[PDB]
Write a protein that binds this DNA or RNA. Structure first.
Lengths: 449, 215
DNA sequence: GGGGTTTTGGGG
DNA sequence: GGGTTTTGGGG
DNA sequence: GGGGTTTTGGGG
């Protein structure tokens, strides 16, 4: 049997093992310190300790282990952690709970929202509202009397996050002041874009309430929950004084990127107040070389939720993988290596609906018959380039160029805009976000501009 | 630009691996701090760390002008590289962490001297240059450029998918590999049509310098 | 047996 | 504990 | 002392 105590009422005198339920509002990533020690530090709250009178107040939790796997990975602020056998002491004025998981202490994470982060990523349902989505040791036991404790704390967690910022202004630094910091700092910003730099790395395009834009490398395995449009808290970042072409944030192995539970007032406000910036972009289009990635296209709103499929899967597995076979409409990203036909003037051909044939615009019903040679992160190293079509005779991709089809041999204005577009598309670091439809072994662009 | 290494390695890639085309005012002695000596010898410039590649002559010379001062124990001590060159090499990036996209910029060290003189310098935590956003991006530009030239030289004749194939596809099924096009005149499955001449230059395996000092 | 702990020799 | 491993692209 | 385990009483 376990007796759970509230954070503010935990004994500072009796250095005896105590147990508790708390809300996690911050945490480093589990990190190694030497050859046998791993550590994870977090900030916790509960109905008795949550607010200084205005900035948020909290206790600190320090978990020690001998294996990376014995520590909690905190992807989202707002979830609940249950700890068994922790010793409480005062560290520089703050209530600090210490727990050696490598000995007799244990922990278990409970989702405050319907699904845990991982469950949202994989689209799974939670076994039950009383099941820990993660815990140390081979087993975890929850008693009947615990249910009310957990259910109540959840309710409290939502009330707390919905009426308070939780991550108060004193807990992070405005991005346009980052360069003024002596060392590392924290940031709260919206993810404007997630660029797959390579096989193992994501590049986050961030922008906080100050309006400043920054980029930072985010490993896929470490932070698989990063999503465009979402607001995250970055625990420990440093200004990169060596990054010239763009503003870059440096993260360490202990750094952490954390999302917020649905009820978060702060996340809700930042999502709405912070709007997409393309300025850091715009300037590039005037440079011969852009170290900053540029996503040239935007997919139709109705697909914004559609998951993407790599070129590798699209061209090498689409005729073998069960899942890919049952789909005829995909979303993918890539960069154009070459556009065919070479002569931009021949991009628009005349089409004879009856004979299913096209001809040079020296004659026909006008349509685009462009063939892109593409490549992406998943195929970066191979000796291939892939064909993606923009055949609009049936309507698919008719407005891709924001130029209605026309005889490019006669309409100078149309030819010029398409020529410009061609230079942008084949320029280094230019990318395309598009939806495609599979027809007779080929992919056609649609609902993209 | 601030990071000597970042600038040096960036200029190398931005000049098709030709070390003679890189600024001359950058070919001055390199004063760097030793972050690690074994199992991986890594030196920093106050912002990044790179792996120096010593020539057999470089160590023999060192082992003479500096008797008993072991190299594999230089950790946390500064070294001054007086003679050095930069080469470009093809490697397996899944095995060599001091590289990216199967490409590596190597610092060939011919002569270096140790300064144990309580050498200091308050610095930020050094990071792998080949993990830096901008630098990775630089190497990507390099590859994109080579890839584009190869494709515009290998792909010709506007072999466009015949419109009928996709505009009357009710009773038509096809294989997606039909859309796969070779980007160059390669041998295997890896793109290798580059034009920089892969420098050779023999170097010592870090373990050999450890045996030559403590069998 | 062996960890981490202190129980510092001995439960279940 | 607001930190720094190597598993040297979770650590 | 108490886990997990097997050592089933007894080390460092």
């Amino acid at each position: 049997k376990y007796e759970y105590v509230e954070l503010a009422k935990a004994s500072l005198t009796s250095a005896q093992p105590q147990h508790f339920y708390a809300v996690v509002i911050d945490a480093t990533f589990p990190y190694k310190t030497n050859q046998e020690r791993y550590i994870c530090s977090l900030k916790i709250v509960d109905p008795t300790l949550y607010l200084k009178q205005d900035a948020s107040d909290y206790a600190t939790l320090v978990l020690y282990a001998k294996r990376f796997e014995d520590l909690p990975i905190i992807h989202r602020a707002g979830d609940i952690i249950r700890v068994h056998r922790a010793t409480l002491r005062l560290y520089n004025g703050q209530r600090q709970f210490n727990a050696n998981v490598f000995y007799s202490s244990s922990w278990a994470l409970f989702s405050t929202d319907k699904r845990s982060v991982t469950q949202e990523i994989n689209n799974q349902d939670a076994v039950s509202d009383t099941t820990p989505f993660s815990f140390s040791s081979k087993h975890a036991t929850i008693e009947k009397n615990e249910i009310s404790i957990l259910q109540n704390l959840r309710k409290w967690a939502n009330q707390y996050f919905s009426s308070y910022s939780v991550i108060s202004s004193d807990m992070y630094t405005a991005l346009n002041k980052a360069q003024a910091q002596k060392g590392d700092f924290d940031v709260v910003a919206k993810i404007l874009q997630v660029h797959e730099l390579d096989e193992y790395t994501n590049e986050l395009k961030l922008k906080d309430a100050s309006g400043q834009v920054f980029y930072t490398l985010s490993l896929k395995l470490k932070f698989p929950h990063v999503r465009t449009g979402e607001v995250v808290r970055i625990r420990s970042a440093t200004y990169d004084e060596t990054s010239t072409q763009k503003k870059v944030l440096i993260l360490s192995h202990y750094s952490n990127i954390i999302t917020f539970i649905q009820s978060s007032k702060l996340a809700k406000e930042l999502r709405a107040k912070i709007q997409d910036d393309h300025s850091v972009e715009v300037a590039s289009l005037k440079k011969n070389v852009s170290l900053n990635a540029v996503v040239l296209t935007e997919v139709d709103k109705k697909h914004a939720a559609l998951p993407s499929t790599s070129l590798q899967d699209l061209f090498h597995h689409a005729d073998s993988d069960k899942e890919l076979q049952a789909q005829d409409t995909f979303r993918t990203q890539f960069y154009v290596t070459k556009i065919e036909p070479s002569d931009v003037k021949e991009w628009v051909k005349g089409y004879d609906r009856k004979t299913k044939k096209s001809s040079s615009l020296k004659k026909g019903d006008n349509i685009f018959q462009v063939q892109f040679l593409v490549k992406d992160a998943s195929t970066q190293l191979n000796n291939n380039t892939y064909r993606v079509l923009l055949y609009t005779q049936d309507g698919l991709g008719a407005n891709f160029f924001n130029v209605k089809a026309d005889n490019l041999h006669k309409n100078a204005d149309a030819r010029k805009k398409l020529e410009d577009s061609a230079e942008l598309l084949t320029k280094f670091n230019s990318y395309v976000d598009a939806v495609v439809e599979r027809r007779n072994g080929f992919y056609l662009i649609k609902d993209t501009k | 630009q601030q990071s000597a290494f970042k600038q040096l390695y960036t200029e190398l890639f931005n000049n098709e691996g030709d070390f003679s085309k890189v600024s001359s005012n950058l070919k001055k002695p390199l004063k760097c701090y030793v972050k690690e000596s074994y199992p991986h010898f890594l030196v920093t410039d106050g912002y990044f760390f790179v792996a120096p590649y010593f020539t057999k002559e470089a160590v023999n010379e060192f082992h003479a002008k500096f008797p008993n001062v072991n190299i594999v124990d230089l950790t946390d001590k500064v070294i001054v590289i007086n003679n050095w060159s930069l080469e470009l090499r093809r490697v397996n990036s899944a095995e060599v962490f001091t590289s990216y996209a199967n490409l590596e910029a190597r610092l060939i060290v011919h002569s270096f001297k140790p300064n144990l003189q309580e050498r200091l310098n308050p610095t930020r935590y050094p990071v792998n240059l080949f993990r830096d956003d901008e630098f990775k991006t630089t190497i990507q530009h390099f590859r994109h450029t080579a890839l584009q030239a190869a494709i515009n030289k290998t792909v010709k004749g506007d072999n466009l998918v015949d419109i009928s194939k996709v505009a009357d596809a009710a009773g038509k099924k096809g294989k997606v590999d039909a859309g796969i096009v070779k980007a160059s005149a390669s041998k295997g499955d890896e793109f290798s049509d580059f034009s920089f001449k892969e420098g050779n230059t023999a170097t010592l395996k870090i373990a050999d310098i450890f045996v030559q000092e403590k069998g």
